[PDB]
């Protein structure tokens, strides 16, 4: 019952992901160098890393079927609210339970709790973030389910500022149904058990991580000496 159309959607989002996630992380070398001496020693590096990631998330979103049909303003609304969430999601790919860090190849480009601390966040965010990664990792999603959950996260109707909620909801539903159907036809048990509802629960976890992230970012950025160290895009998207 996985339709011709739904299979097409999966193929699109998979290719879209491949075009925007370089698993060799080669570009990381353009970033300002990480410093692990350390008053926010990691902020300039992770600033570039996140700014880079925002670019890639935008590129991914633009290839989501229906996403182009939205208004300029709704696309903007969906991206600014989801960006941090989709970065957390897509980061699962580089995250290893082997030591609960994000491992982007080299040790310089391997990032752990203290690096996140040395970028200006408290355990109020870091602990639940690591918990998120752990639980998302345990789900062992097919890459098909991974790219669908990112797309579903982006096209959420209830995001603050949405104009055409009905249109946004109609796009997400097609994606949800595609996901639900993929799991039923393509994900074998025991792994498929409750999998859709578990994935959706991760979206709720993300709203909470997003809420906490905004507060802490609002505090980090509030000081010009911090905000001075970010990138123009992070400032534009996360808040200036």
């Amino acid at each position: 019952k996985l339709s011709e159309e739904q299979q097409h959607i999966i193929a699109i989002l998979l290719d879209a992901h491949h075009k925007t996630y370089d698993p060799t992380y080669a570009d990381f070398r353009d970033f300002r160098p990480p410093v692990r001496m350390s008053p926010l020693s990691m902020l300039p590096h992770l600033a570039d890393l996140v700014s880079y990631s925002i670019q890639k998330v935008i590129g991914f979103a633009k290839m989501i079927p229906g996403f182009r049909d939205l208004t300029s303003d709704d696309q903007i609304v969906l991206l600014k609210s989801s960006a941090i969430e989709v970065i957390m999601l897509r980061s699962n790919q580089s995250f290893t339970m082997d030591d609960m860090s994000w491992d982007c190849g080299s040790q310089d480009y391997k990032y752990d709790v203290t690096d996140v601390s040395k970028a200006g966040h408290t355990l109020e965010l870091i602990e639940p973030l690591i918990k998120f990664q752990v639980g998302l990792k345990k789900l062992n999603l097919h890459e098909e389910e991974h790219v669908l959950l990112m797309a579903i996260c982006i096209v959420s109707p209830d995001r603050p500022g949405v104009q055409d909620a009905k249109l946004v909801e109609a796009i997400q539903d097609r994606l949800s149904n595609t996901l639900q159907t993929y799991i039923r036809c393509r994900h074998p048990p025991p792994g498929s058990h409750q999998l859709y509802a578990k994935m959706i629960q991760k979206l709720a976890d993300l709203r909470s991580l997003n809420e906490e992230h905004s507060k802490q970012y609002r505090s980090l950025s509030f000081q010009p000496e911090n905000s001075m160290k970010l990138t123009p895009l992070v400032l534009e998207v996360f808040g200036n």
């Binding site: 670019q55 935008i58 590129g59 633009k62 300029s72 696309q75 903007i76 991206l79 600014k80 123009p232 895009l233 534009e236 998207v237």
Partner: peptide, 11 residues
Amino acid sequence: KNHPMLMNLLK
């Protein structure tokens, strides 16, 4: 809110 850069990457 005027997002030149985001707007420009969406193009």
